[PDB]
Amino acid sequence: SSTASSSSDGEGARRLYVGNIPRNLNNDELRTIVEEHGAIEIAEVMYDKYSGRSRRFGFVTMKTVEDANAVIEKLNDTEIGGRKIKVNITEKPLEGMDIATTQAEDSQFVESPYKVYIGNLAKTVTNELLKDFFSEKGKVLGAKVQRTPGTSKSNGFGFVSFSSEEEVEAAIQALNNSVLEGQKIRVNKA
RNA sequence: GCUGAGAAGCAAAAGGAGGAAUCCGCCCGAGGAGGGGCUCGCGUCUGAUUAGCUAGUUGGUGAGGUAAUAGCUUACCAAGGCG
Numbered sequence A: 001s002s003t004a005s006s007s008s009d010g011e012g013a014r015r016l017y018v019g020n021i022p023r024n025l026n027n028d029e030l031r032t033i034v035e036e037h038g039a040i041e042i043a044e045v046m047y048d049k050y051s052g053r054s055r056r057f058g059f060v061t062m063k064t065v066e067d068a069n070a071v072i073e074k075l076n077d078t079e080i081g082g083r084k085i086k087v088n089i090t091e092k093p094l095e096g097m098d099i100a101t102t103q104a105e106d107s108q109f110v111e112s113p114y115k116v117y118i119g120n121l122a123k124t125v126t127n128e129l130l131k132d133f134f135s136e137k138g139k140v141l142g143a144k145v146q147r148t149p150g151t152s153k154s155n156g157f158g159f160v161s162f163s164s165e166e167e168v169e170a171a172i173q174a175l176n177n178s179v180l181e182g183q184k185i186r187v188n189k190a
Numbered sequence B: 001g002c003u004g005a006g007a008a009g010c011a012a013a014a015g016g017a018g019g020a021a022u023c024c025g026c027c028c029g030a031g032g033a034g035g036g037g038c039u040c041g042c043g044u045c046u047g048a049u050u051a052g053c054u055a056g057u058u059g060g061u062g063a064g065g066u067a068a069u070a071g072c073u074u075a076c077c078a079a080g081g082c083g
Helices: A002-011 A027-035 A065-075 A098-107 A127-136 A165-175
Strands: A015-019 A040-045 A057-062 A078-080 A083-088 A115-119 A140-146 A157-162 A178-180 A183-189
Touching: A002 A040, A002 A057, A015 A027, A015 A065, A027 A040, A027 A057, A027 A065, A027 A078, A027 A098, A040 A098, A057 A065, A065 A083, A115 A165, A127 A140, A127 A157, A157 A165, A165 A183
Parallel strands: none
Antiparallel strands: A015 A057, A015 A083, A040 A057, A078 A083, A115 A157, A115 A183, A140 A157, A178 A183
16 A cells, blocks of 8 residues: 555656645545546545544545646645645655544544534633533533633633534524623534 | 955845745845936027126135035135126
8 A cells, every 4th residue: 555655656746735625524535526637546634633624734646647737737726525625736645544544434433513612601601500501401411611721710612512413503593692691602513 | 245555354134925846025246127316519588777797706626525526515725707
């Protein structure tokens, strides 16, 4: 498999470099988007997928220099996933990729807008308060305030996870505007 | 590069965008185009019921000054200069 990277190195311009790859964007959708241009032997996505979201830097490797020139030209201004990818050239591409794909497959745990992100919670707001909110509304899994690490005041940020996607949607829509005491909270699915 | 006969000395910099590639820059020079600053020949209204004017005035040197020549400015010398 390191054969694919070494083959590309040897060729010289099988290389094409992909910048601002989205958060949902994956080795397979990189391959599908770029295989139209020509037969990709290999595709490299860097591992920032702790969660779904990506590093937004990757490599693709062609059979030919010419396919790589065509993909560099055509792909730039391509929307994937709501974010737009430039293909200028890369260094001769680097397909650890098998390791990354395995970690990506493992790493992704959370699927679908099932968690709610809290914006604006006032500094008085307690972890228990968030439990009260989340439990009062549609039925509930867990509650967190993101508190300052340096020393540990709320910094007013925080999360729910609910038991259903529907409860997430209702909490987002019902809440946003929301006073909780002293300050106007915004909640989105994340 | 500059000052100076040479001797000698003196003088500059800035990072930013981008994964890179590179691009926009910055500092010191050398040209060019264009834009300016000066100088001069010639042309540029009437009145003699206005006939003398001009003393930094017109020259010269020295010292300064200007982006640059220059009474541009100043001290001294010459008495010029316009009609």
